[PDB]
Amino acid sequence: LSRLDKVEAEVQIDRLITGRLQSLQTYVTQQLIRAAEIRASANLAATKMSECVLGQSKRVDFCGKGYHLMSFPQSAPHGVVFLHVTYVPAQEKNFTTAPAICHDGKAHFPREGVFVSNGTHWFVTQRNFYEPQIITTDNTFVSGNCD
Amino acid sequence: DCTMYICGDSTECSNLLLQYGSFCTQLNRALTGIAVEQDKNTQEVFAQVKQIYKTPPIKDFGGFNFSQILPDPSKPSKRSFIEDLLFNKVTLADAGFIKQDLICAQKFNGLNVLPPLLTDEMIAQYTSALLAGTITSGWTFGAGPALQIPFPMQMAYRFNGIGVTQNVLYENQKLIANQFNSAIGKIQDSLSSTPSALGKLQDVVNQNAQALNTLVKQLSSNFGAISSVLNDILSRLDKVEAEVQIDRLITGRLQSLQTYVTQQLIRAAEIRASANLAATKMSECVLGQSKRVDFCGKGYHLMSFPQSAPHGVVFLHVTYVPAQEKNFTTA
Amino acid sequence: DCTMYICGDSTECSNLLLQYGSFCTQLNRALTGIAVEQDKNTQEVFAQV
Amino acid sequence: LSRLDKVEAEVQIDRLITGRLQSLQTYVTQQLIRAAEIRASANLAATKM
Amino acid sequence: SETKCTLKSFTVEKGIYQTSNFRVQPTESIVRFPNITNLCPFGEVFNATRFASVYAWNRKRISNCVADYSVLYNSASFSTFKCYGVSPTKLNDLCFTNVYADSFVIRGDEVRQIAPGQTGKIADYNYKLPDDFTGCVIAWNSNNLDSKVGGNHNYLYRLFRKSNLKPFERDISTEIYQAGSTPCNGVKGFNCYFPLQSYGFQPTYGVGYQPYRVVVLSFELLHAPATVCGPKKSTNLVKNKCVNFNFNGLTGTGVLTESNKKFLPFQQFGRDIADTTDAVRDPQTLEILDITPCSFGGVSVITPGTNTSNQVAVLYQGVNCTEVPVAIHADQLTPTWRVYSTGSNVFQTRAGCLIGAEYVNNSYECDIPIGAGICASYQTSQSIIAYTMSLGAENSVAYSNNSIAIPINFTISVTTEILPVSMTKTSV
Amino acid sequence: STQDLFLPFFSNVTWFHAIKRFDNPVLPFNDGVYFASTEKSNIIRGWIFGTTLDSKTQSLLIVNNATNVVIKVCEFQFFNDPFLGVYHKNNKSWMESEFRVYSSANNCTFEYVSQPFLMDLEGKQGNFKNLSEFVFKNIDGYFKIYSKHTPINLVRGLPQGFSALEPLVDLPIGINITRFQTLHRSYAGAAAYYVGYLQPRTFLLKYNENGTITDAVDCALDPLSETKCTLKSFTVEKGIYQTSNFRVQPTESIVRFPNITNLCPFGEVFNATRFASVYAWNRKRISNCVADYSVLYNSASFSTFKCYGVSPTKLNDLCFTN
Ligand SMILES: *[C@@H]1O[C@H](CO)[C@@H](O[C@@H]2O[C@H](CO)[C@@H](O[C@H]3O[C@H](CO)[C@@H](O)[C@H](O)[C@@H]3O)[C@H](O)[C@H]2NC(C)=O)[C@H](O)[C@H]1NC(C)=O
Ligand SMILES: *[C@@H]1O[C@H](CO)[C@@H](O[C@@H]2O[C@H](CO)[C@@H](O[C@H]3O[C@H](CO)[C@@H](O)[C@H](O)[C@@H]3O)[C@H](O)[C@H]2NC(C)=O)[C@H](O)[C@H]1NC(C)=O
Ligand SMILES: *[C@@H]1O[C@H](CO)[C@@H](O[C@@H]2O[C@H](CO)[C@@H](O[C@H]3O[C@H](CO)[C@@H](O)[C@H](O)[C@@H]3O)[C@H](O)[C@H]2NC(C)=O)[C@H](O)[C@H]1NC(C)=O
Ligand SMILES: *[C@@H]1O[C@H](CO)[C@@H](O[C@@H]2O[C@H](CO)[C@@H](O[C@H]3O[C@H](CO)[C@@H](O)[C@H](O)[C@@H]3O)[C@H](O)[C@H]2NC(C)=O)[C@H](O)[C@H]1NC(C)=O
Ligand SMILES: *[C@@H]1O[C@H](CO[C@@H]2O[C@@H](C)[C@@H](O)[C@@H](O)[C@@H]2O)[C@@H](O[C@@H]2O[C@H](CO)[C@@H](O)[C@H](O)[C@H]2NC(C)=O)[C@H](O)[C@H]1NC(C)=O
Ligand SMILES: *[C@@H]1O[C@H](CO)[C@@H](O[C@@H]2O[C@H](CO)[C@@H](O)[C@H](O)[C@H]2NC(C)=O)[C@H](O)[C@H]1NC(C)=O
Ligand SMILES: *[C@@H]1O[C@H](CO)[C@@H](O[C@@H]2O[C@H](CO)[C@@H](O)[C@H](O)[C@H]2NC(C)=O)[C@H](O)[C@H]1NC(C)=O
Ligand SMILES: *[C@@H]1O[C@H](CO)[C@@H](O)[C@H](O)[C@H]1NC(C)=O
Ligand SMILES: *[C@@H]1O[C@H](CO)[C@@H](O)[C@H](O)[C@H]1NC(C)=O
Ligand SMILES: *[C@@H]1O[C@H](CO)[C@@H](O)[C@H](O)[C@H]1NC(C)=O
Ligand SMILES: *[C@@H]1O[C@H](CO)[C@@H](O)[C@H](O)[C@H]1NC(C)=O
Ligand SMILES: *[C@@H]1O[C@H](CO)[C@@H](O)[C@H](O)[C@H]1NC(C)=O
Ligand SMILES: *[C@@H]1O[C@H](CO)[C@@H](O)[C@H](O)[C@H]1NC(C)=O
Ligand SMILES: *[C@@H]1O[C@H](CO)[C@@H](O)[C@H](O)[C@H]1NC(C)=O
Structure with a gap:
């Protein structure tokens, strides 16, 4: 302006205005896309809070790796941090198994657990932890025959 | 490549493009971000296991026959019959494995297609590892140490999961196996x-x-100039009034590039959402058994099997459906 | 309608709009995609039986 | 057109066309973003069903 | 240093940084214009005896000759030069399909009326130019050559017409115009004017009425097998090299190879989807030659952390790097540095060619990606190596139809997870 | 796809048959004219182009009189019944004695004689009917010519098939042409020609791999062709395809300006006695009258006209507040 009067100045002013308006529009569009991605992340965070912190989740690999027990939230700048406490088995032993027991000409199946033998005697154990028990009718339910 | 696309091999046009700042740099940054995001998507979808499991040489699974999903050693690649069909049905254009034909016109204008980090054989290896781990150990391999279990007992566990007592399997194993094989054939x-x-x-x-x-095709438009070709514009008009045409060409090509980049960003966001859904489906359906209604297929879910495909993944949801009901009197 | 909106009932303006290429076609394709997506959304929400 | 001869009608109509094309493009981009948000909401509604 | 330029910083992070892409500059230049030598008869155009009147402007055909517009532009006796679509300087470097030369004499104040889109009696009645006229107009006074004290009346123009003429339209009829409502016939009548108007050219007339001889060239360019060219001399042709070629004015750069396109005799150019040329018929040898710009590609710089080391690597995506030895630094390149092209460390991948890294066979976790399953890392006496990434540790399971494994002891682990929630507000 | 002058497909072409004795009618050349011939021994050899044909204005003349083809544009005074007449006259050859086409050629601005154009192709002796297809364009004073010659084996109608025309020569005749007449070889033979009319339209030109046009479709002939041109492809999938929007075109024009008739006193402005000085510049009010800026813009004694917000051309079609 201090160098050119109005008629020939408007020629440069319009070019500058178009350039700066284009830059502003690009900035706004990019901000909108980033905001959409952030809304997606925030919705995921809210769902994780509601299901892992306020309860216990059966969804695999959602609230941490392993069998979920509980969680604790922690604040952070523009975010949130979860501490997923999970149950992981450590040491396994190989065994011999069988699907049923035929004793009085009838098939026996476990109410809860699996049939297991160490090589000489048979027991029933819950699936995720070793605890042998003597075969009892309280452990088994009868249906069908042995053929 | 912004500079070749806008002002291919012209110092005069490059000097004019220099006056506009960092538009080209911003476009390149966005495109690089999208390119990295694609590898991130594939990584999360397929890399859920860290140890590659191998199927046993014996194929005695109690009557179940997985020949149509396990890899076939005769083929040089570890692809099964169904995966072969999936790769056959798709006509993938310009995979980018060194193009030393429309894709030739694209390449010479600065339009490059980059190869993916993970190859179609490594993806098949990941899929085979997942499938072998599932068919050998149930869901334990996704939760911790892999624990072997007979398949005829894993299916009884699944039936117990869907609320059916386990003896139904031990009494109908042969029929159930025949149903599964016939379904796979279908x-x-x-x-x-x-x-x-x-x-x-x-x-x-x-x-x-x-x-x-x-x-x-956008390069053929005059955008108000006297001609669409900068070489002829220079060869006809000298260094003074050629500016009046070149600036119009530069603005038009910049608008075309910006529109392309914005559309690519929106498409990439949609694909990212789809890939997140695919990863969630893998974790929920393949590595375990899900109680969510109509998530892992129609009906009561039992198990699923992943299969690779060009730019995608295919799931085979095995479900339990009742068929023949009888009316009764209740109290 | 791109040409109606920009140059309603003017052949001289239509001729100038012709020089710009496929902008109008791209806009029409995007709008048609959105329109089809709306029906797809309604169908997938309500047509589960 | 009824006031100015074709030569300067060019100089006016090109400016008008550029402005109106910019407005159309802005409208289409905003509609695309809104459609994406609505599609996400529709997917959530289908899952809730 | 180029990565430092790209990042606008003095510290670079461990990874791969795409930089300015390379291009092979042309090795030499070839000129191939048709070898005609006969001079164009511009004498009979500019410096002939007499010019036909504007209402019946003469058209003289000029073709199959070599013209030099420098001697027409450099003369100081001329008055006006304004060219459309072409510049006066650039005429000598370009060829013409056909030369339509229009010459006539008009008034001094009517010189403006030659421009297309203007309005005036001459443009309205006997000489109108197309809205997108291309060519040059030559204007200069000729009063001392075509003006007489007794009155020169041999130049005529039409006064009235039924309607505006089309561009480049010529009318010769002398029909009496019916200016009034009632029709008439015969030689003359009331409100019945003879279409042609006469003028008494005399030297006593001041500026603005003097006769101004005007020559207008309306050639069309570079969409046809041109036949009129400038004084540029031909040059021998070579193949299989990136060369700055120009056939009949088609300035361009690339490597040319004899294609198999059957150009029909009225066809001189072949074009791609993007309206760029793809083949050309040489004006001297009637074969057909394909044109492709010589190879190019991106440049990536593979580097470890700046504090860790300074040694780097280079990757050429999409380029079979057998051309890299051909990329000798005799001709220049967009990237100035070439010291890495020494060799003995060259490896080909599906993602391109990697130079400056030693390929090994042992596998590791993928440190920084290159592409197509190959990725590099910096370690041990330390250098940048390249290897195929390992998917994991192989582990077979002992399946059998009558064995199970159940755990005996358990461990409790705690795992962290970070999720962005919100971003900074901003108003502009 | 190209947008310019082109004949629509499936057009209702006018047809001719030279079965005896006959005459060649005169037909308009508005917006270009399509022309075809399935003939024997090259009976059709020329055309006459013009707007008045009676030496009042210029006209175009093309004749293939055995020795060579002549192209001539003059002030032709054509005869009312132009014909050509020719056999085995002591030389075993056939000679064309008569060239009765015009009587006056006062001023000529364009002439051309190179060679005859009876380029007969393979087969010989007219075993298969020869299709000589011609299209002529007269745009901005440029007369463009396209030509073809191909054999067909259909008995009477136009051969159902595809072809394209090569350009022959461009003629800068620069004359007004609204009508045309065709030429002949009068000596045992029958000839037929079609008279079609070019139109500004668009077609999808399907070039083959070798550079020869193999097929073409219209963009406005029928809805299927409009979908084809919209999709830029020759195959259409099942579905609904939105195409170009319609608009009702206006039936007639109405002019409604105020019905005042007194002429504006521009005489008291321009042809006034004296003006006021620049420091006290005069102002005169003019309203409620009839003006005409053409008489102000057409005077040659004036020096400068710079009109801002308005062009000098559009002044007579605009009305002013005050
Ligand atoms: C598989 O598990 C079986 C159950 O523990 C186990 O049998 C048990 O063996 C112990 C010996 O370590 C017996 O304990 C008795 O051992 C002697 C035998 O004379 C007694 O003097 C002791 O006082 C003690 O009572 C258990 O009675 C016996 N239990 C059963 C149900 O048989 C097998 O030895 C295990 N087999 C293998 C291969 O590990
Ligand atoms: C598991 O399922 C497999 C697929 O159904 C099945 O392979 C199929 O086996 C049959 C017979 O063995 C083949 O049929 C052909 O067999 C020989 C080949 O020369 C011919 O003599 C026959 O007439 C017939 O053409 C099928 O081709 C084959 N399927 C495929 C895809 O190769 C396995 O046998 C099944 N395994 C078990 C243990 O059940
Ligand atoms: C080329 O020749 C054409 C044929 O003469 C000529 O068209 C003619 O133009 C005149 C002038 O307008 C018309 O005369 C009629 O004009 C109006 C109708 O718009 C009537 O009100 C008048 O009373 C008068 O009858 C002719 O009718 C018209 N001829 C045809 C066949 O339409 C062109 O103008 C000529 N072109 C050039 C560039 O000179
Ligand atoms: C077919 O029509 C042609 C067009 O009129 C006609 O061309 C005419 O040919 C004669 C002689 O060949 C020319 O007469 C002049 O020819 C040369 C020119 O230098 C001189 O040596 C002669 O003495 C004589 O001056 C005509 O000028 C020429 N017509 C035109 C318009 O140029 C053919 O002769 C015609 N053929 C037959 C068989 O009739
Ligand atoms: C449990 O057993 C499996 C394999 O079954 C055993 O095979 C013999 C070794 C013998 O001990 C049989 O009685 C068993 O039935 C073990 O898997 C093996 O592990 C070792 C490493 O310890 C490895 O070298 C082998 O390759 C594995 N087997 C196969 C077929 O790959 C498993 O380790 C055993 N678990 C424990 C806790 O001992
Ligand atoms: C990279 O280029 C080289 C040569 O430029 C290719 O080597 C050619 O390979 C083909 C196929 O085996 C042979 O017919 C040629 O004779 C080879 N050329 C030479 C000079 O030896 C090489 O194949 C290319 N790389 C890839 C991956 O295709
Ligand atoms: C067209 O030709 C005619 C006749 O050759 C020209 O008319 C002659 O013009 C001269 C010059 O004034 C007169 O002396 C003759 O009397 C005219 N003859 C006739 C019969 O009128 C006419 O000038 C030519 N047209 C052009 C544009 O030159
Ligand atoms: C016309 O005459 C001048 C002066 O003699 C001469 O220089 C010029 O070359 C002539 N014109 C042409 C086209 O040669
Ligand atoms: C150029 O010169 C060569 C050698 O004399 C000749 O064969 C060729 O025909 C010439 N070019 C043309 C277009 O005639
Ligand atoms: C790089 O090394 C220097 C010195 O060894 C160290 O101070 C700096 O922290 C290192 N960079 C990072 C990012 O830790
Ligand atoms: C890797 O092994 C292959 C064969 O197993 C061999 O040809 C190649 O030379 C080896 N690479 C190196 C760097 O030794
Ligand atoms: C062609 O036009 C003529 C005359 O109007 C008419 O008799 C004939 O039916 C038309 N034919 C077609 C196919 O339109
Ligand atoms: C035969 O040809 C000659 C030369 O071409 C010619 O002079 C003669 O008149 C011809 N014969 C007749 C009968 O015209
Ligand atoms: C002034 O006088 C001239 C000469 O007669 C006349 O043509 C002109 O119309 C007059 N001015 C006006 C504005 O009428």
């Missing part, structure tokens, strides 16, 4: 017969191809 026939199934992938392939084609 999938084989359906995928060998119909073609509209893989339209969901052919659509994104066509979208990318058509977007690149339109971007290529």
